[PDB]
Amino acid sequence: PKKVLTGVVVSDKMQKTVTVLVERQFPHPLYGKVIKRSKKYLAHDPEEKYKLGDVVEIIESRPISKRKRFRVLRLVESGRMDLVEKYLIRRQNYQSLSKR
Amino acid sequence: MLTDPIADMLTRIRNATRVYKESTDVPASRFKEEILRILAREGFIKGYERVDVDGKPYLRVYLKYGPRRQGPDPRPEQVIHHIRRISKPGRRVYVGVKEIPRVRRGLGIAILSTSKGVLTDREARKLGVGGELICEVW
Amino acid sequence: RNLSALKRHRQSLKRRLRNKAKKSAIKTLSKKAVQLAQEGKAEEALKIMRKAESLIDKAAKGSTLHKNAAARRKSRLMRKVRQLLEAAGAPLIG
Amino acid sequence: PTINQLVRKGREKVRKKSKVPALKGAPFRRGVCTVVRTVTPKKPNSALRKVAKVRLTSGYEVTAYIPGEGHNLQEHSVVLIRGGRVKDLPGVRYHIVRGVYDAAGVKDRKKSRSKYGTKKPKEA
Amino acid sequence: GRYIGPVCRLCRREGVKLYLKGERCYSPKCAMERRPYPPGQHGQKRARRPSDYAVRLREKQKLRRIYGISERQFRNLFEEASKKKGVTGSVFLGLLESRLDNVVYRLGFAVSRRQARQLVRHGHITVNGRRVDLPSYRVRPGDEIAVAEKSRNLELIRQNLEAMKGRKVGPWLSLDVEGMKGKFLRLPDREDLALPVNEQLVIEFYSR
Amino acid sequence: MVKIRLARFGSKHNPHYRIVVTDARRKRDGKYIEKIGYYDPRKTTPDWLKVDVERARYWLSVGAQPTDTARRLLRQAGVFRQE
RNA sequence: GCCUACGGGCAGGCGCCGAGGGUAGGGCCCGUGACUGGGGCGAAGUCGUAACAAGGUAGCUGUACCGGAAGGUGCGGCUGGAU
RNA sequence: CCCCAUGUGGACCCGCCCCUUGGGGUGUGUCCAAAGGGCUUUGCCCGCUUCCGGAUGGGCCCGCGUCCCAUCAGCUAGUUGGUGGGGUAAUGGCCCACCAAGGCGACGACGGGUAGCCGGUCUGAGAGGAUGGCCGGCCACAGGGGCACUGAGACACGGGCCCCACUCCUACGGGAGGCAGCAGUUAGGAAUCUUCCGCAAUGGGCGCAAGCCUGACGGAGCGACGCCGCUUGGAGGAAGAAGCCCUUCGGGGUGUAAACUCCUGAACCCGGGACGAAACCCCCGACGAGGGGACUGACGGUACCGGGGUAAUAGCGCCGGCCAACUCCGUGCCAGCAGCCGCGGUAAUACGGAGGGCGCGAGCGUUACCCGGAUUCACUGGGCGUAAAGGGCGUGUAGGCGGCCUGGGGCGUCCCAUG
Ligand SMILES: [Zn+2]
């Protein structure tokens, strides 16, 4: 069963590619409470249809670019920046906390 | 803020018996009702009736105690010695049926919430299910 | 300080030369057939493509052409030809 | 700490510091004696203890103790070390295996011979 | 070194009669008769209250020394006995009583436990048909523990059976003196044992 | 070329084999494919050899040259008896 | 040049990449070390008495300056200050 | 080895039909096959060619899992993506060209340190911690680094080409080498074996087969290095020898211990003597099934059976408390002991010997290292007024956590079956 993940487009700067934020949930291997973790997959859009802030289903595909082995399945829920915003503010925060 | 309902409840219960009150009030809610539903049928308490305090819905849980002791400090054995939430919020603990715990060599009881509803360890096992293990009480 | 299981190297050389002349042979022929289609020599071009296709499949018979290897070469050649024969249509032979 | 704490953070597991730099986890290690002193005891007890400075195979030049009513350890003699701190003698974390190498076993020992590396005396 | 040294001295260390030599440990002399004090230059001295450990200890030994068996096996047994479904103690005595060398003794084919060993190592013992020299061997229920045809006319063994006409055999055992045979019926029960020990202490000891 | 062979499993002087199926190229005592019987050289037990002809037949069918000695045991089991 | 059924193949030549080296500069880690801080130890000398009882100018403290020394003083804070 | 013909079929281009990422059917065009050898030689055996399928083996790919340091916080330029091309069995920046400006990072990027991973194994009540040699599975190297050839498969430990370090031959031009295979040598080290036997068995290769090779293997040997079994004897034997120890001098003790009596009989001696081995082969039968015949052991004259047969190794630690085991003498803060508390300055159950005793037994101690005790990193299962611990206060970012009723979805979560 080729894997399927549901996530969100966060990046749309690339060519025919979209970065998808995929959230996963699970009990901590020892402490027990539900930890929420995530990963970004570089999906693949041929006809450049998928747009930022769209939730999509990812499916395991034939290797494409170095680190781009997934095609996008179908659009789940369109228009929902809400989530992006988070990813974004988190990224921005990164600018802080350093030795520059 | 009130962070955990049940938790409060249990504590009102725990906190009341200890001082020896006849009954104690507590914010109502279908769920909380199903837990009190257990207690009384399990015998830890007399019972409970729905009520309104100045317009708000409350559950009068009626306390149950033991007989008057002899000698000094004739403070009656309490029917509910122990009572604590097991699965807390931000560390929820769900158990598998195999994993359901036996309480106090089976003298106490355990109450979970299965998809077949809120139950007793005994019932659960008889029922072949498992779920959020809400609390220990003995 | 000897060992007769070396005859193999004595042999490999034989096949190195063997494979070599065949492989290159193809390259040349392909590269030949190619520049023909550039000019639009519909007749001869194929006259050559054909000598090509054969050579390829011939090495495929042996240990010179991996198998599907012949195939790729058969695709990458013909395709590169058909297309060029658009700059001046009508394939003479076939 | 809140379970979350234990989550983000985790429990630090206690690292162990080895009371004995015999480099390798080797049980002993031979070494050539350098100086042969007589350090004095610590606070309560006082007397005069025979000791030895030793240059090992591992590299470090250390201080080892020499048990026994009396040894026979000279300057450039080779010896052996077992490891066993001595309370009333600071910096002396090791020991000299008696009976092995150029270190003799105590003569006239009829008891704890296992140690001191003496041999079964005669009478049958 | 499977012991073998001064004996009815241990009869003395424990303060309880240790049937280690048989005949004689019946004549006024397993020494306990007339010299119950333990050995040593201080035997006759008042003894201080024995630490929990001490009793747990002394009682292990009492068991052990009786069967005269190197701690190593003894402890091994006790280990094997913990792994079996049962009362960790009763089962201990189980194998303990199931050793070929013991059996022979209970069967009466010998004056004492010790003696039984030799009888075994020298091979005067049949077991379900074949001889056996390994005492530590475990006699399964329903085995004909006997004497070798070869050994039957023995000045020892003979004089022993002669005595048997006059002593009942353990309830879990049978024997046909007439033919010098004997069978191991079933694992003996704690209630059936006579031993002056308290397994509980023994068990309790192996948890330190 | 997958073969059908034995596997040492006994010990020093106590050989106890294991009829199995595996790719030629693997070790004697290495990862086999489908264990189909064991044979005891010394024959201490009245049951010193078993087989399950049902599976044996599979293999051969699919193509699995058996060892000389191996075969011999399959013959004893009646692996190929066509009556 | 070599071979050829003249289609073409080998030899050879050049080229890219390239292990490694050279020169310049930078960074980082190991060994040895002159010169050097303090530290801890230990019986115990020397000068003084800071602290522990209001320890004999209550103590402690951030800071600041000063001084054989401990410490003294200013300023603020604290009671973990006796009457 | 090459060419030419045949083409069951198969390849490639193009077109269509079905599917649905390079899956399948189909049409024209074009391209592609091949070796012979042996007998019991008019047929059987071995081998050969194209293609579909099987089986086994494997490449690439993805999700989850996977050590310490934040006194390492920003890393990245083929670097992230796109088009085309190359290259491969094959997807792919894997490689090139051009284009775009990306990609990753506190859910810890990058840097540094360390380590082959797992089945399992050790400890632990468990949770967990530790480990990962022998056996098995997977990876990685085969003096250091680079590279390709041949091939189903290698970038190839006992194949190849180059440079480098090192060793050896050298007519000084130039060569020859790689035990991290078995055994051994030396070095280093606290420390780790015989240049043994056999190819009988199991396995592998090549062979129609007989058969060849097999330091894979199966055996032996050396090491108490571990574990397990086994022996040094059994019974009888004094109100109790002698000696040694102690004493209140009367006696206590070592001690049934010994002596001595009888009995058994390890070692040792003679005889017999093994499974493991039944195939391939040969014969009959149809070289099928089935049945019959022959050969073939390193271990080894060993195990093991039978007979005969001698009473025939014991040692180490400990004895103040924890911790089972006490007296005398020598000693005199000395000599020394010691894990920790400590012991020793003339009365030492703590030093050194002795008598005695406890513990364990071909072993017992010691050191080193793992888990344990330690709920002393605390998920089980800890804390923070003075014991070490609340951030000098606020503000709010990420994040965590969240009230009552009803419904949908069912991701977490629970149950069943199945792989
Ligand atoms: Zn006795």
mmCIF file of N, CA and C (backbone and C1' of nucleotides) in Angstrom, chain H residues 14-49:
data_model
loop_
_atom_site.group_PDB
_atom_site.id
_atom_site.type_symbol
_atom_site.label_atom_id
_atom_site.label_comp_id
_atom_site.label_asym_id
_atom_site.label_seq_id
_atom_site.Cartn_x
_atom_site.Cartn_y
_atom_site.Cartn_z
ATOM 1 P P C H 14 7.481 7.153 -31.351
ATOM 2 O "O5'" C H 14 6.410 6.823 -32.486
ATOM 3 C "C5'" C H 14 6.316 7.643 -33.645
ATOM 4 C "C4'" C H 14 5.283 7.101 -34.612
ATOM 5 C "C3'" C H 14 3.853 6.942 -34.128
ATOM 6 O "O3'" C H 14 3.181 8.190 -34.170
ATOM 7 C "C1'" C H 14 4.478 5.047 -35.371
ATOM 8 P P G H 15 1.978 8.480 -33.145
ATOM 9 O "O5'" G H 15 0.832 7.460 -33.594
ATOM 10 C "C5'" G H 15 0.074 7.724 -34.770
ATOM 11 C "C4'" G H 15 -0.907 6.613 -35.051
ATOM 12 C "C3'" G H 15 -1.849 6.213 -33.938
ATOM 13 O "O3'" G H 15 -2.909 7.147 -33.806
ATOM 14 C "C1'" G H 15 -1.091 4.296 -35.085
ATOM 15 P P C H 16 -3.526 7.435 -32.356
ATOM 16 O "O5'" C H 16 -4.564 6.250 -32.122
ATOM 17 C "C5'" C H 16 -5.672 6.084 -32.996
ATOM 18 C "C4'" C H 16 -6.161 4.666 -32.947
ATOM 19 C "C3'" C H 16 -6.669 4.190 -31.599
ATOM 20 O "O3'" C H 16 -8.024 4.607 -31.362
ATOM 21 C "C1'" C H 16 -5.275 2.534 -32.557
ATOM 22 P P C H 17 -8.633 4.554 -29.858
ATOM 23 O "O5'" C H 17 -8.710 3.001 -29.514
ATOM 24 C "C5'" C H 17 -9.803 2.207 -29.942
ATOM 25 C "C4'" C H 17 -9.825 0.926 -29.157
ATOM 26 C "C3'" C H 17 -9.708 1.136 -27.662
ATOM 27 O "O3'" C H 17 -10.924 1.508 -27.055
ATOM 28 C "C1'" C H 17 -8.164 -0.501 -28.273
ATOM 29 P P C H 18 -10.883 2.250 -25.636
ATOM 30 O "O5'" C H 18 -10.190 1.179 -24.672
ATOM 31 C "C5'" C H 18 -10.794 -0.094 -24.483
ATOM 32 C "C4'" C H 18 -10.034 -0.918 -23.468
ATOM 33 C "C3'" C H 18 -9.751 -0.313 -22.101
ATOM 34 O "O3'" C H 18 -10.903 -0.339 -21.256
ATOM 35 C "C1'" C H 18 -7.844 -1.466 -22.879
ATOM 36 P P C H 19 -10.927 0.540 -19.901
ATOM 37 O "O5'" C H 19 -9.973 -0.293 -18.940
ATOM 38 C "C5'" C H 19 -9.160 0.370 -17.989
ATOM 39 C "C4'" C H 19 -7.833 -0.322 -17.865
ATOM 40 C "C3'" C H 19 -6.920 0.319 -16.843
ATOM 41 O "O3'" C H 19 -7.260 -0.171 -15.556
ATOM 42 C "C1'" C H 19 -5.724 -0.014 -18.831
ATOM 43 P P U H 20 -7.195 0.815 -14.297
ATOM 44 O "O5'" U H 20 -5.730 0.526 -13.757
ATOM 45 C "C5'" U H 20 -4.927 1.566 -13.217
ATOM 46 C "C4'" U H 20 -4.041 2.157 -14.288
ATOM 47 C "C3'" U H 20 -3.135 3.305 -13.837
ATOM 48 O "O3'" U H 20 -1.885 2.691 -13.434
ATOM 49 C "C1'" U H 20 -4.033 3.600 -16.042
ATOM 50 P P U H 21 -0.738 3.531 -12.635
ATOM 51 O "O5'" U H 21 -0.231 4.652 -13.645
ATOM 52 C "C5'" U H 21 0.771 4.357 -14.605
ATOM 53 C "C4'" U H 21 1.424 5.624 -15.057
ATOM 54 C "C3'" U H 21 2.754 5.414 -15.763
ATOM 55 O "O3'" U H 21 2.449 5.596 -17.160
ATOM 56 C "C1'" U H 21 2.908 7.008 -13.962
ATOM 57 P P G H 22 3.506 5.192 -18.315
ATOM 58 O "O5'" G H 22 3.883 3.672 -18.006
ATOM 59 C "C5'" G H 22 4.012 2.707 -19.056
ATOM 60 C "C4'" G H 22 5.405 2.142 -19.065
ATOM 61 C "C3'" G H 22 5.843 1.479 -17.763
ATOM 62 O "O3'" G H 22 5.629 0.055 -17.717
ATOM 63 C "C1'" G H 22 7.545 2.913 -18.651
ATOM 64 P P G H 23 5.621 -0.838 -19.071
ATOM 65 O "O5'" G H 23 4.509 -1.942 -18.787
ATOM 66 C "C5'" G H 23 4.544 -2.721 -17.583
ATOM 67 C "C4'" G H 23 3.156 -3.244 -17.223
ATOM 68 C "C3'" G H 23 2.385 -3.902 -18.349
ATOM 69 O "O3'" G H 23 2.858 -5.235 -18.521
ATOM 70 C "C1'" G H 23 0.982 -2.384 -17.260
ATOM 71 P P G H 24 3.355 -5.729 -19.973
ATOM 72 O "O5'" G H 24 1.987 -6.088 -20.700
ATOM 73 C "C5'" G H 24 1.104 -7.038 -20.117
ATOM 74 C "C4'" G H 24 -0.227 -6.982 -20.792
ATOM 75 C "C3'" G H 24 -0.180 -7.072 -22.309
ATOM 76 O "O3'" G H 24 0.004 -8.396 -22.802
ATOM 77 C "C1'" G H 24 -1.668 -5.366 -21.669
ATOM 78 P P G H 25 0.376 -8.623 -24.357
ATOM 79 O "O5'" G H 25 -0.947 -8.200 -25.145
ATOM 80 C "C5'" G H 25 -2.098 -9.049 -25.150
ATOM 81 C "C4'" G H 25 -3.130 -8.528 -26.116
ATOM 82 C "C3'" G H 25 -2.607 -8.285 -27.515
ATOM 83 O "O3'" G H 25 -2.519 -9.480 -28.269
ATOM 84 C "C1'" G H 25 -3.834 -6.404 -26.829
ATOM 85 P P U H 26 -1.356 -9.615 -29.385
ATOM 86 O "O5'" U H 26 -1.841 -8.628 -30.554
ATOM 87 C "C5'" U H 26 -3.177 -8.692 -31.074
ATOM 88 C "C4'" U H 26 -3.476 -7.483 -31.931
ATOM 89 C "C3'" U H 26 -2.417 -7.138 -32.957
ATOM 90 O "O3'" U H 26 -2.530 -7.936 -34.112
ATOM 91 C "C1'" U H 26 -3.093 -5.175 -31.860
ATOM 92 P P G H 27 -1.230 -8.200 -35.005
ATOM 93 O "O5'" G H 27 -1.302 -7.052 -36.088
ATOM 94 C "C5'" G H 27 -2.426 -6.945 -36.931
ATOM 95 C "C4'" G H 27 -2.336 -5.672 -37.702
ATOM 96 C "C3'" G H 27 -0.977 -5.437 -38.340
ATOM 97 O "O3'" G H 27 -0.808 -6.133 -39.571
ATOM 98 C "C1'" G H 27 -1.590 -3.525 -37.153
ATOM 99 P P U H 28 0.637 -6.757 -39.943
ATOM 100 O "O5'" U H 28 1.365 -5.562 -40.707
ATOM 101 C "C5'" U H 28 0.793 -5.013 -41.886
ATOM 102 C "C4'" U H 28 1.501 -3.745 -42.262
ATOM 103 C "C3'" U H 28 3.010 -3.856 -42.391
ATOM 104 O "O3'" U H 28 3.432 -4.375 -43.653
ATOM 105 C "C1'" U H 28 2.471 -1.935 -41.112
ATOM 106 P P G H 29 4.946 -4.898 -43.825
ATOM 107 O "O5'" G H 29 5.837 -3.726 -43.196
ATOM 108 C "C5'" G H 29 6.045 -2.488 -43.886
ATOM 109 C "C4'" G H 29 7.243 -1.743 -43.311
ATOM 110 C "C3'" G H 29 8.475 -2.568 -42.940
ATOM 111 O "O3'" G H 29 9.279 -2.886 -44.089
ATOM 112 C "C1'" G H 29 8.026 -0.972 -41.222
ATOM 113 P P U H 30 10.296 -4.145 -44.056
ATOM 114 O "O5'" U H 30 11.404 -3.736 -42.987
ATOM 115 C "C5'" U H 30 12.281 -2.640 -43.247
ATOM 116 C "C4'" U H 30 13.026 -2.259 -41.998
ATOM 117 C "C3'" U H 30 13.815 -3.392 -41.368
ATOM 118 O "O3'" U H 30 15.091 -3.487 -41.996
ATOM 119 C "C1'" U H 30 12.543 -2.294 -39.709
ATOM 120 P P C H 31 15.838 -4.910 -42.074
ATOM 121 O "O5'" C H 31 16.291 -5.191 -40.568
ATOM 122 C "C5'" C H 31 17.468 -4.576 -40.047
ATOM 123 C "C4'" C H 31 17.613 -4.851 -38.570
ATOM 124 C "C3'" C H 31 17.711 -6.304 -38.151
ATOM 125 O "O3'" C H 31 19.049 -6.772 -38.287
ATOM 126 C "C1'" C H 31 16.158 -5.185 -36.774
ATOM 127 P P C H 32 19.329 -8.332 -38.591
ATOM 128 O "O5'" C H 32 19.126 -9.018 -37.184
ATOM 129 C "C5'" C H 32 19.927 -8.634 -36.093
ATOM 130 C "C4'" C H 32 19.603 -9.503 -34.927
ATOM 131 C "C3'" C H 32 19.509 -10.977 -35.285
ATOM 132 O "O3'" C H 32 20.824 -11.544 -35.203
ATOM 133 C "C1'" C H 32 17.604 -10.310 -34.048
ATOM 134 P P A H 33 21.435 -12.401 -36.429
ATOM 135 O "O5'" A H 33 21.253 -13.884 -35.904
ATOM 136 C "C5'" A H 33 19.957 -14.350 -35.588
ATOM 137 C "C4'" A H 33 19.984 -15.155 -34.325
ATOM 138 C "C3'" A H 33 20.781 -16.446 -34.433
ATOM 139 O "O3'" A H 33 22.093 -16.183 -33.933
ATOM 140 C "C1'" A H 33 18.617 -16.838 -33.502
ATOM 141 P P A H 34 23.396 -16.567 -34.797
ATOM 142 O "O5'" A H 34 23.776 -18.040 -34.312
ATOM 143 C "C5'" A H 34 24.217 -18.296 -32.975
ATOM 144 C "C4'" A H 34 23.734 -19.656 -32.504
ATOM 145 C "C3'" A H 34 24.167 -20.857 -33.327
ATOM 146 O "O3'" A H 34 25.399 -21.353 -32.814
ATOM 147 C "C1'" A H 34 21.832 -20.949 -32.963
ATOM 148 P P A H 35 26.654 -21.569 -33.802
ATOM 149 O "O5'" A H 35 27.420 -22.819 -33.164
ATOM 150 C "C5'" A H 35 28.242 -23.677 -33.966
ATOM 151 C "C4'" A H 35 27.952 -25.120 -33.634
ATOM 152 C "C3'" A H 35 26.481 -25.473 -33.760
ATOM 153 O "O3'" A H 35 26.204 -25.923 -35.101
ATOM 154 C "C1'" A H 35 27.331 -26.128 -31.624
ATOM 155 P P G H 36 26.711 -27.375 -35.627
ATOM 156 O "O5'" G H 36 28.102 -27.674 -34.903
ATOM 157 C "C5'" G H 36 28.607 -29.018 -34.825
ATOM 158 C "C4'" G H 36 29.294 -29.258 -33.489
ATOM 159 C "C3'" G H 36 29.543 -30.716 -33.086
ATOM 160 O "O3'" G H 36 30.773 -31.277 -33.544
ATOM 161 C "C1'" G H 36 28.459 -29.610 -31.306
ATOM 162 P P G H 37 30.952 -32.882 -33.583
ATOM 163 O "O5'" G H 37 30.986 -33.344 -32.066
ATOM 164 C "C5'" G H 37 32.138 -33.136 -31.272
ATOM 165 C "C4'" G H 37 31.894 -33.662 -29.883
ATOM 166 C "C3'" G H 37 31.586 -35.148 -29.724
ATOM 167 O "O3'" G H 37 32.796 -35.931 -29.742
ATOM 168 C "C1'" G H 37 30.032 -33.876 -28.457
ATOM 169 P P G H 38 32.739 -37.529 -29.986
ATOM 170 O "O5'" G H 38 31.835 -38.081 -28.800
ATOM 171 C "C5'" G H 38 32.300 -38.062 -27.449
ATOM 172 C "C4'" G H 38 31.416 -38.929 -26.567
ATOM 173 C "C3'" G H 38 31.065 -40.290 -27.138
ATOM 174 O "O3'" G H 38 32.116 -41.198 -26.902
ATOM 175 C "C1'" G H 38 29.115 -39.286 -26.296
ATOM 176 P P C H 39 32.119 -42.603 -27.655
ATOM 177 O "O5'" C H 39 31.553 -43.564 -26.530
ATOM 178 C "C5'" C H 39 30.922 -44.769 -26.875
ATOM 179 C "C4'" C H 39 29.585 -44.846 -26.209
ATOM 180 C "C3'" C H 39 28.744 -45.989 -26.737
ATOM 181 O "O3'" C H 39 29.039 -47.156 -25.989
ATOM 182 C "C1'" C H 39 27.502 -43.985 -26.804
ATOM 183 P P U H 40 29.346 -48.529 -26.760
ATOM 184 O "O5'" U H 40 27.922 -49.248 -26.756
ATOM 185 C "C5'" U H 40 27.281 -49.640 -27.970
ATOM 186 C "C4'" U H 40 25.786 -49.613 -27.789
ATOM 187 C "C3'" U H 40 25.177 -48.226 -27.704
ATOM 188 O "O3'" U H 40 24.876 -47.735 -29.010
ATOM 189 C "C1'" U H 40 24.533 -49.464 -25.807
ATOM 190 P P U H 41 24.021 -48.635 -30.042
ATOM 191 O "O5'" U H 41 23.870 -47.704 -31.311
ATOM 192 C "C5'" U H 41 22.920 -46.656 -31.306
ATOM 193 C "C4'" U H 41 23.271 -45.649 -32.361
ATOM 194 C "C3'" U H 41 23.634 -46.262 -33.703
ATOM 195 O "O3'" U H 41 22.433 -46.451 -34.461
ATOM 196 C "C1'" U H 41 25.140 -44.487 -33.111
ATOM 197 P P U H 42 21.409 -47.645 -34.083
ATOM 198 O "O5'" U H 42 20.013 -46.907 -33.903
ATOM 199 C "C5'" U H 42 18.851 -47.405 -34.550
ATOM 200 C "C4'" U H 42 18.119 -46.286 -35.245
ATOM 201 C "C3'" U H 42 17.179 -46.773 -36.340
ATOM 202 O "O3'" U H 42 15.822 -46.999 -35.902
ATOM 203 C "C1'" U H 42 18.566 -44.982 -37.127
ATOM 204 P P G H 43 15.377 -46.706 -34.368
ATOM 205 O "O5'" G H 43 15.704 -45.147 -34.170
ATOM 206 C "C5'" G H 43 15.024 -44.317 -33.199
ATOM 207 C "C4'" G H 43 15.916 -44.106 -31.994
ATOM 208 C "C3'" G H 43 15.750 -42.894 -31.084
ATOM 209 O "O3'" G H 43 14.760 -43.110 -30.088
ATOM 210 C "C1'" G H 43 18.032 -43.502 -31.365
ATOM 211 P P C H 44 14.524 -42.002 -28.933
ATOM 212 O "O5'" C H 44 15.752 -42.122 -27.919
ATOM 213 C "C5'" C H 44 15.538 -42.494 -26.556
ATOM 214 C "C4'" C H 44 16.818 -42.379 -25.755
ATOM 215 C "C3'" C H 44 17.294 -40.994 -25.364
ATOM 216 O "O3'" C H 44 16.613 -40.479 -24.240
ATOM 217 C "C1'" C H 44 19.135 -42.220 -26.137
ATOM 218 P P C H 45 16.800 -38.936 -23.854
ATOM 219 O "O5'" C H 45 18.304 -38.838 -23.372
ATOM 220 C "C5'" C H 45 18.704 -39.491 -22.186
ATOM 221 C "C4'" C H 45 20.190 -39.353 -21.995
ATOM 222 C "C3'" C H 45 20.731 -37.944 -21.925
ATOM 223 O "O3'" C H 45 20.492 -37.340 -20.673
ATOM 224 C "C1'" C H 45 22.085 -39.163 -23.386
ATOM 225 P P C H 46 19.980 -35.817 -20.633
ATOM 226 O "O5'" C H 46 21.315 -34.942 -20.798
ATOM 227 C "C5'" C H 46 22.330 -34.940 -19.782
ATOM 228 C "C4'" C H 46 23.645 -34.383 -20.307
ATOM 229 C "C3'" C H 46 23.642 -32.973 -20.862
ATOM 230 O "O3'" C H 46 23.599 -31.973 -19.862
ATOM 231 C "C1'" C H 46 24.819 -34.332 -22.348
ATOM 232 P P G H 47 22.521 -30.790 -19.996
ATOM 233 O "O5'" G H 47 23.152 -29.746 -21.027
ATOM 234 C "C5'" G H 47 24.496 -29.300 -20.887
ATOM 235 C "C4'" G H 47 25.064 -28.875 -22.225
ATOM 236 C "C3'" G H 47 24.315 -27.793 -22.984
ATOM 237 O "O3'" G H 47 24.675 -26.497 -22.500
ATOM 238 C "C1'" G H 47 24.900 -29.535 -24.467
ATOM 239 P P C H 48 23.680 -25.244 -22.718
ATOM 240 O "O5'" C H 48 23.517 -25.081 -24.299
ATOM 241 C "C5'" C H 48 24.636 -24.733 -25.111
ATOM 242 C "C4'" C H 48 24.193 -24.421 -26.510
ATOM 243 C "C3'" C H 48 23.042 -23.451 -26.560
ATOM 244 O "O3'" C H 48 23.521 -22.133 -26.455
ATOM 245 C "C1'" C H 48 22.668 -25.224 -28.073
ATOM 246 P P U H 49 22.525 -20.975 -25.990
ATOM 247 O "O5'" U H 49 21.569 -20.803 -27.240
ATOM 248 C "C5'" U H 49 22.043 -20.162 -28.399
ATOM 249 C "C4'" U H 49 20.891 -19.851 -29.294
ATOM 250 C "C3'" U H 49 19.768 -19.078 -28.628
ATOM 251 O "O3'" U H 49 20.024 -17.681 -28.684
ATOM 252 C "C1'" U H 49 18.884 -20.897 -29.866
#
